[PDB]
Amino acid sequence: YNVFPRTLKWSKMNLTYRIVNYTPDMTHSEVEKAFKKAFKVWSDVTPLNFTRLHDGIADIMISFGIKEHGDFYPFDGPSGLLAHAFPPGPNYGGDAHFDDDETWTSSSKGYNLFLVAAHEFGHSLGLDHSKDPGALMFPIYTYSHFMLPDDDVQGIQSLYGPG
């Protein structure tokens, strides 16, 4: 027999990502900075490294879309679903999609892109939702400096080990 195997973790430490397109709500540089900082959340406590590609295929393809956007997991307009990401694997595996019917910001006016991305990239690296209300990986959004909670540190190091 065969079951559907789940790439619990990336079998490689050096991963690439690409920002495929951009939300209207923030400057290109603000978006790039938020995503860079969201990966650094994870790379800071593991041996994982992330390098940005500007074209072609990367392990982690990042994009903004609305409603049905090419994976049959449609978004739902403002509020509700904010973003989703696929667990590690080929093709859509690892990819992160953000609902461009939300208002994204570098601040508190709408949804903080950095924080949601940080959460999403946790899914891209193999983490599930946490039960701990204080965990970044908790399924509920809440809003200058960010410290990865111990619950998330333990979860990700259980997959990849410490840096």
Add this chain to the structure above:
Amino acid sequence: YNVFPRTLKWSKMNLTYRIVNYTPDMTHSEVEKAFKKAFKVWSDVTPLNFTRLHDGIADIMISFGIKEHGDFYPFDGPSGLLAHAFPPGPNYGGDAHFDDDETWTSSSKGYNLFLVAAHEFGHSLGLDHSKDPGALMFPIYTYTFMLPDDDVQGIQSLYGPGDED
């Protein structure tokens, strides 16, 4: 904290299903019985329970359709692809689609809905195809029921045996 399960499986033992629509080929009662019997194939050898919903959102949505029917796996008219089902997961995960350009039966003619459904539900629960030509999860249709051991071992590797007796 939680890491993604090693294998694609449902994290709860109580699952729901919904028959969204019906083939022209069989009565509602015939279709209902075939699907009920197909779920029992798997509930009998695990701790899984399946409850039917008449509407709303179920874990396993069952529908008949033809050609393009709302996913990346369009059917192809009579013959060829008969049906497919998505592995455990959010939204369409678990869902099972039957090509309504086929002839569905409760006999040995055409395609026996019960047998194709039991196979599809194996996919809905996290089984891929087997290389064992006697397995229910073997990828080619043949008409015959007792769940083969290759499939029992497969499904129990995921969910355990439930009550062994």
